[PDB]
Amino acid sequence: GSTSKLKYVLQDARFFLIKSNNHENVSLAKAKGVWSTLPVNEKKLNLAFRSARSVILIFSVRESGKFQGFARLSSESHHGSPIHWVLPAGMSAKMLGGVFKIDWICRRELPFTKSAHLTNPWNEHKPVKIGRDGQEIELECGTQLCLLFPPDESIDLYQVIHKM
Ligand SMILES: O=C(O)c1c(Cl)cccc1Oc1ccc(F)cc1
């Protein structure tokens, strides 16, 4: 299977590692195509969205040993139908910023064992699995990381390719 469409989507991308707190919220985000974060990281992502042809979120639930997929921002965050996230301990829906609409590019998992050869120059050349929530990943490392994920037959890139 050709990777030309995915390489096109990634040509001028920025990449951010999302260290999700709860697997259930990743499931919600996957199903509904929406995501939200704290205003600190939100502002950084809204700026990125204006700065690059694609902004890619690469999800890795904390302590999971895996990435759970990756998605492209379709919009800057907006404030809308409320999403009922599973709120982690000591968190409240008030702490969250607006909602990003996101188009999932892959919803299949990638174990850290499969990315162990990739290092992120923008995180001190550490293996790319290592990073805080919102860690930016350099273009080539991010591109290669996305290309390691298995093909996802539930995904059709047509809508993304049209939004571009
Ligand atoms: O990381 C998640 O589980 C998560 C996701 Cl995927 C989407 C939306 C919210 C999430 O959790 C939070 C809930 C409230 C907060 F104030 C901060 C994070």
Swiss-Prot record:
The modification Phosphoserine is found at S81, S92. Changing R132D: Does not affect ability to influence alternative splice site selection. Changing K19L: Does not affect ability to influence alternative splice site selection. Changing N25D: Abolished binding to N6-methyladenosine (m6A)-containing RNAs. Tyrosine phosphorylated. Regulator of alternative splicing that specifically recognizes and binds N6-methyladenosine (m6A)-containing RNAs. M6A is a modification present at internal sites of mRNAs and some non-coding RNAs and plays a role in the efficiency of mRNA splicing, processing and stability. Acts as a key regulator of exon-inclusion or exon-skipping during alternative splicing via interaction with mRNA splicing factors SRSF3 and SRSF10. This is YTH domain-containing protein 1. It comes from Homo sapiens. The lineage of its organism: Eukaryota, Metazoa, Chordata, Craniata, Vertebrata. The gene is YTHDC1.
